Design a protein around this ligand. Structure first.
Ligand SMILES: *C(=O)N1C[C@H](NOS(=O)(=O)O)CC[C@H]1C(N)=O
Length: 360
């Protein structure tokens, strides 16, 4: 039976990696030939024995940036902002700062000139502290030259896109973005009535870990969603034309590459690779040096359509969770892997590659 073969393929990819990385619970969702398939493993909470299901909520960390990118795509389609706008055009407090010479594109693609991975610990989740942080910041190098993966960078991009729409970022995601995408199990602030679905996260010595408040957390890493909802988001990405036009264009804006770093082409949120490509190369593109070190970019002469024979992906983590999303536009194939342990990106890619290969 084809169901037996598919279960065998996914189990063979997942089971050893869960055991090796001591993952308590893991949800897989696959979109194949326009049909969804779910595979759920282990426990959402070890303490109460709640099992993972396709409706369990996981923290997706940096995968949130693809949602942030979608909201910015919507602001672009509505002509409320342009990627070449100066960042300070959208926030008067930034006028006269170094943000007068940094574009929204630089912010979105981590090339603003050395904005750090995280806000310093001295910056709390407070509007005035965030404002003052950006007003005083000075680039280490020229904007548009080096990519340094950064939550304050794309966080500001999302914050400015929301300002361009005249509403708070979190309100726009809840009231407009998630409903437009048909996402009813996707949250920035999990409702009390949905808490029973929120998985526990696990760190060292199995300490419980759920993400706490931080500056621009919603924009950079704040989404909690189920494997079923994240697959719905992947399916919207595979077929933007099925949504109402403004939202179709918003999703299309996240499928455009601006530059290359090694085998990776950088879009808004999504990162793309030629497909097929070796597992080692895909792991190297999602490796620690890509997250922690600056890289000189190879700018494209024109934005490149991220479609056809390409794999678009995003890793995301929080202290207690590890997520991975990947899809092949030219093959109508999509995958979501959500876990309640922050396990190495290389291991997430290893599961995904075994599944994607087996399906091919
Ligand atoms: C996203 O989840 N984050 C940003 C950073 N690198 O992202 S990647 O490895 O998920 O692409 C470090 C991990 C994480 C964070 N802690 O903010």
């Amino acid at each position: 039976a084809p169901a037996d073969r598919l279960k065998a393929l996914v189990d063979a990819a997942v089971q050893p990696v869960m055991k090796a990385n001591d993952i308590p619970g893991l949800a897989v969702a696959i979109s194949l030939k326009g049909e969804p398939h779910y595979f759920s493993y282990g426990l959402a909470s070890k303490e109460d024995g709640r099992r993972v299901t396709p409706e369990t909520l996981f923290e997706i960390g940096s995968v949130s940036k693809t949602f942030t990118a979608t909201l910015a795509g919507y602001a672009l389609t509505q002509d409320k902002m342009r990627l070449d706008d100066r960042a300070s055009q959208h926030w008067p407090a930034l006028q006269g700062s170094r943000f007068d010479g940094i574009s929204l594109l630089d912010l979105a693609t981590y090339t603003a000139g050395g904005l750090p991975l995280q806000f310093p610990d001295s910056v709390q989740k407070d509007q005035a502290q965030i404002r003052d942080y950006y007003r005083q910041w000075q680039p280490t190098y020229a904007p548009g030259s080096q990519r340094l993966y950064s939550n304050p960078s794309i966080g500001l991009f999302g914050y400015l896109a929301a300002r361009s729409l005249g509403q708070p970022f979190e309100r726009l995601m809840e009231q407009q973005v998630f409903p437009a995408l048909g996402l009813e199990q996707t949250h920035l602030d999990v409702p009390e009535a949905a808490l029973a679905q929120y998985a526990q996260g696990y760190g060292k010595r199995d300490r419980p870990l759920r993400v706490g408040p931080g500056p621009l957390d919603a924009e950079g890493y704040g989404v909690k969603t189920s494997a079923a909802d994240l697959l719905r988001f992947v399916d919207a990405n595979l077929h933007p034309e099925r949504l109402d036009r403004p939202w179709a264009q918003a999703l299309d804006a996240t499928h455009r590459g601006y530059y290359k770093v090694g085998d990776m082409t950088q879009g808004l949120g999504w990162e793309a690779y030629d497909w097929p490509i070796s597992l080692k190369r895909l792991q190297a593109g999602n490796s620690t040096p890509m997250a922690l070190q600056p890289h000189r970019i190879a700018r494209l002469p024109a934005p490149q359509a991220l479609e056809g024979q390409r794999l678009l992906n995003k890793t995301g983590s929080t202290n207690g969770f590890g997520a991975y999303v990947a899809f092949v536009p030219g093959r109508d194939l999509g995958l979501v892997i959500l876990a309640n342990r922050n396990y190495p990106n290389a291991e997430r890619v290893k599961i995904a590659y075994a599944i994607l290969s087996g399906l091919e």
